[PDB]
């Protein structure tokens, strides 16, 4: 049989979605009319195949990212995970414990005085 789409179809569909995302939707018969006025396509049979893969890609873009395609609506919420999160109002606080050999390393560096301490096991874990 074989219904795999060649690079002429797959590249033209991506370039249409990058420029005209706000015009497009789930109805094949409306996508088929939009793709005829925003582009010069030499054949009716090629126009139908391009509007078909555009209709498949719109239903994917409604769920999450597609690695070859970018839109403002998806970039500005990436820019909101970029900058600072709502997670906490202060850092994880520096009040943390110290091992006896780190206490000795800090003693030689003229520092300490703010950490609790405890010892590890009697012999190396196996």
């Amino acid at each position: 049989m074989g219904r795999v789409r060649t690079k002429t179809v797959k590249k033209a569909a991506r370039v249409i979605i990058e420029k005209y995302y706000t015009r497009l939707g789930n109805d094949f018969h409306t996508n088929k009319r939009v793709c005829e006025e925003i582009a010069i396509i030499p054949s009716k049979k090629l126009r139908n195949k391009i509007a078909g893969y555009v209709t498949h890609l719109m239903k994917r873009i409604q769920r999450g990212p597609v690695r070859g395609i970018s839109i403002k609506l998806q970039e500005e919420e990436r820019e909101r995970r970029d900058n600072y999160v709502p997670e906490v109002s202060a850092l994880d606080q520096e009040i943390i414990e110290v091992d006896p050999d780190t206490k000795e390393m800090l003693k030689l560096l003229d520092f300490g005085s703010l950490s609790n301490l405890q010892v590890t096991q009697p012999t190396v874990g196996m």
Partner: protein, 313 residues
């Protein structure tokens, strides 16, 4: 306050319902269009087994039927199509008496004048066009028109201000004088393309909506803006009630009503779940009509059905 309930369903179609039309002359008849190329005329009944039966079907258009409307005497109906041609039907025989030709693409909406002596149409061809009922074109709007597809055209119902209103994919609403053949006023505000425009039966207000999910109100004679209502995801169709101060909208898989005294949602209408392995699980609502009685609502869907709701206390 008042609340809706489901009455029954109508089954005789093979594609999406595109529009429904009704009159006060024949309350046992309704008329509806589809992507199956044909217009159905329904005999409604009050029998307990099924709410209606397909009585006749009109078959002459060569692609999808986009809009349908009925004469105020109930004798004739007018319709547009994706084949670019416009036709007037005798409902007694089920035959076309005249055919209108002169668009060179694809026709999206049509209307009769309030006196029923003139016809108006809009299309993907970017031109609004005016017709005599003898099938001859009388004016073309050309350069002052929308920059993109003309999505809708409507008449004001009142006689003392003879004007028409329109919306388009260039996201503008425009108002036009009939006898002077010219533009009166732009309205600007919407962010997406527009699917619909409608006017209140007292001839006072517009409503408009589309992809942005907002319904915006505007004045017809004062020429100015009124409040905005957030609908939800998308607007497919709008109508005012014939005897209450209500606006109704079809919005994705649901239908919704606002009481305009105090601006509040009265109820929202939804469908029983059929479990589906993908996004957009429910079918969408595509068109609305209130009956001439005002007490019952018809709605069309992408699953080839018309669903009927009554009002209740």
């Amino acid at each position: 306050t008042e609340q809706m309930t489901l009455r029954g369903t109508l089954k005789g179609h093979n594609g999406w319902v595109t529009q429904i039309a009704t009159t006060p002359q024949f309350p046992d008849m309704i008329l509806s269009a589809s992507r199956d190329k044909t217009i159905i005329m329904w005999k409604l009944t009050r029998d307990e087994t099924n709410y209606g039966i397909p009585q006749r079907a009109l078959r002459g258009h060569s692609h999808f039927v986009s809009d349908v409307v009925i004469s105020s005497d109930g004798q004739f109906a007018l319709s547009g199509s994706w084949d670019g041609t416009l036709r007037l039907w005798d409902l007694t025989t089920g035959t076309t008496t005249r055919r209108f030709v002169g668009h060179t693409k694809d026709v999206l909406s049509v209307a009769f004048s309030s006196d029923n002596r003139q016809i108006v149409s809009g299309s993907r061809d970017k031109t609004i066009k005016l017709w005599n009922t003898l099938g001859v074109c009388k004016y073309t709007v050309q350069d002052e028109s929308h920059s993109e597809w003309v999505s809708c055209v409507r008449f004001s119902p009142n006689s003392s201000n003879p004007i028409i209103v329109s919306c388009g994919w260039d996201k503008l609403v425009k108002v036009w004088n009939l006898a002077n053949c010219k533009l009166k006023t732009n309205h600007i505000g919407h962010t997406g393309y527009l699917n619909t425009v409608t006017v209140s039966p007292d001839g006072s207000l517009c409503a408009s909506g589309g992809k942005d999910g907002q319904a915006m109100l505007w004045d017809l004679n004062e020429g100015k803006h009124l409040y905005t209502l957030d609908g939800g995801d998308i607007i497919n169709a709008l109508c005012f009630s014939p005897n209450r101060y209500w606006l109704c909208a079809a919005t994705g898989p649901s239908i919704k009503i606002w009481d305009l005294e105090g601006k509040i949602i009265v109820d929202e209408l939804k469908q029983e779940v059929i479990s589906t392995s993908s996004k957009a699980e429910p079918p969408q609502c595509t068109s609305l009509a209130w009956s001439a009685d005002g007490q019952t609502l018809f709605a069309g869907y992408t699953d080839n059905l018309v669903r009927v709701w009554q009002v209740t206390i």
